[PDB]
Every structure is written in C-alpha cells, then in structure tokens.
C-alpha cells in the first residue's frame, strides 16, 4: 500500500505566474522494468477527473504545453507555466507501479487576483412557498473575491441566525470570482409578524459593510 | 468520441446490495480493461474494481474483496458493478473508467458518474421554489434571477437554464446539509430588457428520486 503524500494541500497563483505541485511517494515508482508509472490528473469543478500526464512526463494529447511532470524514485513535480484562469482545479498524481494503485489526496489550485465587491441581490420568499407553510429569504452575493465573507439577517433591526445557511459556488473558471448565498428559512407565520429584512455582509477587505434590504408592507 | 455514462445510482441501506452499471460508446469496447474508481465525500480517490478486456481475469482491492463484483458484458457494450454488505465508507461517487492499451497503466477516459448514499434515510423528491426580485427598487442593467431547491436526500441536484441554452453568468453554489436534507440554489443574472421579454426557465434534476422539474420565473 504506496502512501502518494502531496505538499501544497492548497495552492493559490496569479494569472500568467507559475505554480509548482509536488509529489512524494512512499516507496520508489520504478517498476522491475525501470518504468515509472506515475501519471497526473487534473479534476476542474463538477467534473471527472482527466489524464493531463502519463509516465512522469509525458503530456497526453490536448494538454498544452505548459504543462510538464519530473522527477523519479519517490520525488515527482508538475508545473504550470503561464497559470491560466481555467487551471483551477484539483490535480491529483497517481501511481500504478505496485499493486494496490493509489492516488494522492489532491492539490486545490486556487487564482489569485485584485479584491472585488459583491452585487447583492436580497429575495423576498415566493407565494408558492408561502403557500405550503414556509418563508425562505434569500440574498445573494455575487462576483468578489477573496473567498471570506460573513453575511448576518436582521429582521426589524435584530439580529437572526437561526435558520441560517450559506452556501459559496465554486471559483469562476472565467472571471475568478465567487458568489454565494444566505438563506434564512422561517415559518409564514413569523416571516408574517414582521415588516422589515436586511442582509449585511462583511469581510475583512472592508472596514465598511454592505447593506440590503426590504419591506414587506411595501410588497 | 468515446463515453461512458453510468447508472445505478441510489439510496441504500447497511447490509444492502446494489448494482450500478456504465453503457459504453464510440470504442470497441472488447479490447480495453475497464475500472471503477470511486470518490468519497472528502474528496479522495480509490480503485475499487479492474475487469481484463475480455473479462477472465478480475482485481479487487482488499477494502472491498469478497463484497463487489466487476462484470463486463462484450456483447452489449456494458460493465457492470455488482455491491454487498454495503458500509457507510461505501458511500461515494463511483466512476466507470478505461485503461489505456499500451499498457502504460493509465485511465484515459472517465464517465460523470453514479453517487451511491449509504444510510438510513429516505429518499426525497425537492421543492423548486423561484427567486424573485420585489418589494424593494429593482432597477436598471440588469436583473438577477434564480431558483431555490430545497428538501432532497440524497444528493446531487442539477439545476440548469433554458434546457442548457442559458450558461452564461449562470452561478450554483454547493448544496448545504441540514436535518437530513440538502439545499442549494441556482441564479442568472440577465439583460432587465429580456425579462419578462421572455419566459425564463430552470431545469432541476435529482437522479435517486427520478425526478425532473421544470419552474418559470414570472414576476410579482
């Protein structure tokens, strides 16, 4: 059982600067023929996992050349050149040289870039929930960066988290953004008792905060 | 071009059995040795099943000999995976790959794959609910939109727009656990001249409950 130990755990880069990936092996990946059998893969978010490199070195066909593995024995490196916004994902080295064939436990490639506000969007619940009993309140922040954001609910001033989730998309394979959204789920009977629901986010890349808000008596 | 898409897929019990299955294409399926590699919710991989391409010789790793069974049907370009005595470390999103041919020991081509949920939990059907802007100044370039999935186990939803037509600026966020069931949600955010210009829809699938749905989003 070939323990495959990878260091960063997380890497974040800027566009066009290189990121360098290591991967260390238990035991030696030279086969009894000298071959080495040990391949990477890069797995972007919502997909499969795909061959980027195959025998330490070799690029499988339609991966650009920036892309290029070294190393032997325990020791193997890949690096990314010219970092573009759609590498972002988790590269995984693999070996299959002994018997059980393992895998690393994943490198998360992360873009760097400039700070970046959110647009909120707040969501007042849908007469269809209200319908059936429920009042879910939604607000939405989109496109900023970096990851790290707290959003808090006041309902007529005052402060709520229960019923409370929050829940981030994936980094933007275009822009390099993320979004996210607070959803603050009540009964229609006490979304009913009060008028007035504010959104507030924070961050630590602002000493402001981000207001948004609404009236149901102004529905 | 080559795929393979599997199916199977579930919601099960301790102690049960269930059997996934990948309908390959666009190769000749008979002389390639085929896999399925599995990904557990902490995000990490393992080799759980290795079938020889005219399916004699079998490999199974020591974590699930004994329970799984690999089987190829050469005839109707079909792999199968056979699963028992189901473990909650069972519980993964398993993948049907293939190995390469010049035995440079390589999977070269992976399906999107089937989730396997191992638990006590029911299966549950989500609510769609729409995102509407109101009660408050929506004005101006453009206008956000989305849907809300809520009350599903197990998981994955996917939501798309306009039966895939509508990708751009579309974002999903992870679904979120809670009492035993997931939520997410899924927004557009469009040009204010073309909503309610035209009718605008999202598409929730959630495979496990065999479910599909279609909302509209209409103002007010």
């Known amino acids: 059982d070939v323990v495959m130990t990878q260091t960063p755990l997380s890497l974040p880069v800027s566009l066009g600067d290189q990121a360098s990936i290591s991967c260390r092996s238990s035991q030696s990946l030279v086969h009894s023929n000298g071959n080495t059998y040990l391949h990477w893969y890069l797995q972007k978010p919502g997909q499969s996992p795909k061959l980027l490199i195959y025998?330490?070195?070799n690029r499988f066909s339609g991966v650009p050349d920036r892309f290029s593995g070294s190393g032997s024995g325990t020791d193997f490196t890949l690096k990314i050149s010219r970092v573009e916004a759609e590498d972002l994902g988790v590269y995984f080295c693999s070996q299959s040289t002994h018997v059980p064939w393992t895998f690393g436990g994943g490198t998360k490639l992360e873009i760097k870039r400039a700070d970046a506000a959110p647009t909120v969007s707040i969501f007042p619940p849908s007469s269809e929930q209200l319908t059936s009993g429920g009042a879910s309140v939604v607000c939405f922040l989109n496109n900023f960066y970096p990851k790290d954001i707290n959003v808090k609910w006041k309902i007529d001033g005052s402060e709520r988290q229960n019923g409370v989730l929050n829940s981030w998309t994936d980094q933007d394979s275009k822009d390099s953004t993320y979004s996210m959204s607070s959803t603050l789920t009540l009964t229609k009977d006490e979304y009913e008792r009060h008028n007035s629901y504010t959104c507030e986010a924070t961050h630590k890349t602002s000493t402001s905060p981000i207001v948004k808000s609404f009236n149901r008596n102004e529905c | 071009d080559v795929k393979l898409v599997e199916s199977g897929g579930g919601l099960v019990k301790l102690g049960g059995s269930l059997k996934l299955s990948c309908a390959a294409s666009?190769?000749?399926?008979?002389?390639?040795?085929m896999s399925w590699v599995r990904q557990t919710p902490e995000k990490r991989l393992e080799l759980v099943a290795v079938?020889?391409?005219?399916?004699?010789?079998?490999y199974y790793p020591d974590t699930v000999k004994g329970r799984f069974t690999i089987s190829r049907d050469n005839a109707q370009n079909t792999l199968y995976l056979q699963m028992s005595s189901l473990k909650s470390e069972d519980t993964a999103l398993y993948y049907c790959?293939?190995?390469?041919?010049?035995?440079?020991?390589?999977?070269?081509?992976w399906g999107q794959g089937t989730t396997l949920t191992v638990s006590s939990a029911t299966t549950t059907a989500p609510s769609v609910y729409p995102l509407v802007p109101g009660c408050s100044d929506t004005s101006g370039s453009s206008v956000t939109l989305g849907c809300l999935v809520k009350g599903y186990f197990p998981e994955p939803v996917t939501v798309k727009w306009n039966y895939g037509a509508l990708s751009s600026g579309v974002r999903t966020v992870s679904s979120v656990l809670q009492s035993g069931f997931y939520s997410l949600s899924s927004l557009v955010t469009v040009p204010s001249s073309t909503w309610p210009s035209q009718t605008v829809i999202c598409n929730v699938a959630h495979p496990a409950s065999k479910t599909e749905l279609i909302k509209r989003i209409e103002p007010r």
């Open positions: 790959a293939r190995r390469d041919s010049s035995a440079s020991l390589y999977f070269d081509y």
């Open positions: 079938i020889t391409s005219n399916g004699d010789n079998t």
């Open positions: 666009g190769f000749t399926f008979s002389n390639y040795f």
């Open positions: 025998k330490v070195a």
